[PDB]
Amino acid sequence: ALEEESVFAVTAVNASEKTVVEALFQRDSLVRQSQLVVDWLESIAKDEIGEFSDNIEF
Amino acid sequence: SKADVERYIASVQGSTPSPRQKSMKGFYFAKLYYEAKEYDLAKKYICTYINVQERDPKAHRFLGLLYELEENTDKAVECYRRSVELNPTQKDLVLKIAELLCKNDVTDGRAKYWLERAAKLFPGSPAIYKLKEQLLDCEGEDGWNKLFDLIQSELYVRPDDVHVNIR
Amino acid sequence: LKELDSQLNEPREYIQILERRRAFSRWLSCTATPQIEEEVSLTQKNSPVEAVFSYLTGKRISEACSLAQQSGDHRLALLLSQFVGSQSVRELLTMQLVDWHQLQADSFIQDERLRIFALLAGKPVWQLSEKKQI
């Protein structure tokens, strides 16, 4: 809501899969906010794992 | 230049057998013609991709931008409208439909309806304040009261400073 | 070529060397395909592993992945599709060959498949626990 007046972007015809997604995450607040919910929910599962990774006997 | 885009598109359509595979390259062909200002050749190569990928919101948006660069207001709006139908996340394109409708007709209930849709995606926006301003000074004495309530209720979010208080 | 003549500026020595190599990286497939296409016509029905190796020695990675999905070798198709750039998979197979040799699990895998793993790992010759060389 402070950047929206400015972003008169243009896509490159030679763009990669990476650089189409580097553009998407600027272009799209629904995709951007949806990933912030993924990062959030992955951070909850991370903090329940903590120090424990090397305590696994096979 | 044109002749370099034509030489590339000739050799790249030589390195293509079937017609649908030539149409699948049409998006790329169209942006190279646009990068030569060959706007009809861009339109002609994006439409021959769209008639093979009917549901691509960027191909519809690119055809809309080509009609905006041919001053064809409602065809730019229709291709942008169709891109919002095919990807509703484009808040910017909901606003651009209001921007091209209020620049075509101020009485158009579609202009006012797409501004309604832009405001409900971007509250507290001076670019939406002035798209209301451009309708309400044209709504007369019934306009005056809506313009008063607007000025007070959107100044109460954040002014531009100076201008709206002098007006 | 048809890739430097498109450039409206004097083209840098590296961009020339890059497209000389990209053109020669077509040449070395075109000089090989009719022998690969006969070799595959013979091997495909007896050993799909040699047919997959023959496609890979002509850079036909798409056809190699396709034949590996057709033969029932789907983790070979996954391994091959990822090989179009990453050094990480080249070093992971460099480790896995060093595991299988030292632990004498190499002699529990096809020599024809170990030949593909050596090619992918960037190894011209591999030395097995059997003292066989591939």
End-to-end Cα distance of chain A, whole Å, is 52 Å
Share of residues in strands of chain A: under 5%
Q: What summary fits the major beta sheet of chain A?
A: none
The Cα radius of gyration of chain B reads: 21 Å
Helix content of chain A: 55-70%
Largest interface: A-B, 11 and 14 residues
Oligomeric state of this protein: part of a larger assembly
What is the strand tally of chain A?
A: 0
Number of helices of chain A: 2
Supply the helix-strand structural class of chain B: mainly alpha
Which overall shape of chain B is indicated by the principal axes computed on the Cα atoms?
A: elongated
Structural class of chain A: mainly alpha
The amount of beta strand of chain B, in percent, is: under 5%
Count, helices of chain B? 11
Form type of chain A: elongated
What is Rg of chain A?
18 Å
How far from one another are the termini of chain B? Answer: 49 Å
Q: What is the helix/strand order of chain B?
A: HHHHHHHHHHH
Helix content, binned percent of chain B? over 70%
Account of the 3D structure:
Chain B: TPR repeats lie at residues 23-56, 57-90, 91-125. Chain B: The modification Phosphothreonine is found at residue 16. Chain B: It is found in: Nucleus; Nucleus membrane; Nucleus, Nuclear pore complex; Nucleus envelope. Chain B: The modification Phosphoserine is found at residue 18. Chain B: Belongs to the RanBP2 E3 ligase family. The structure is cut from a larger assembly and holds chains A (58 residues), B (167 residues) and C (134 residues). Chain A has 58 residues and is mostly helical. Chain A contains 2 helices and no strands. Chain A has helices at residues 17-27, 29-49. The longest helix of chain A has 21 residues, at 29-49. Chain B is elongated and about 65 Å long. The longest helix of chain B is centred in the last third of the chain and has 16 residues, at 140-155. Chain B has 11 helices and no strands. Chain B is mainly alpha-helical. Chain C has 134 residues and is an all-alpha fold. Helices cover 63% and strands 0% of the residues of chain C. Chain C starts with 12 loop residues before the first helix and ends in a 14-residue tail after the last helix. The chains are: A mainly alpha (58), B mainly alpha (167), C mainly alpha (134). Chains in contact: A-B, B-C. The interface between A and B is medium-sized, with 11 and 14 residues.
